[PDB]
């Protein structure tokens, strides 16, 4: 599967404050999609879609905050 956070669990932005999402899940995704709206320190980031596949499930969508070690959303890219 694919994750949302790498082996960080302790650096710079070891968490994720998600403001807005664009999926319902993103069921069938492309290799472009959206940039999730995550906020950090004083700035906000955009995470488009490096790869395509499905948008299986989201656990802690928006409104709440997630860490690393924990997942957020996952992606399937069966052959990358």
UniProtKB/Swiss-Prot annotation:
Residues 1-76 form the Lipoyl-binding domain. The modification N6-lipoyllysine is found at residue 42. The pyruvate dehydrogenase complex catalyzes the overall conversion of pyruvate to acetyl-CoA and CO(2). It contains multiple copies of three enzymatic components: pyruvate dehydrogenase (E1), dihydrolipoamide acetyltransferase (E2) and lipoamide dehydrogenase (E3). Forms a 60-polypeptide structural core with icosahedral symmetry. Belongs to the 2-oxoacid dehydrogenase family. This is Dihydrolipoyllysine-residue acetyltransferase component of pyruvate dehydrogenase complex. It comes from Geobacillus stearothermophilus. The gene is pdhC. The chain holds residues 2 to 81 of 428 of the full protein.
């Amino acid at each position: 599967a694919f994750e949302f956070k790498l082996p960080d669990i302790g650096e710079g932005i070891h968490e994720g404050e998600i403001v807005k999402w664009f999926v319902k899940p993103g069921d069938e995704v492309n290799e472009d999609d959206v940039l999730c709206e995550v906020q950090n320190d004083k700035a906000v980031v955009e995470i488009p879609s490096p790869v395509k596949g499905k948008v299986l499930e989201i656990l802690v969508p928006e409104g709440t905050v997630a860490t690393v070690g924990q997942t957020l959303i996952t992606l399937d890219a069966p052959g990358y």
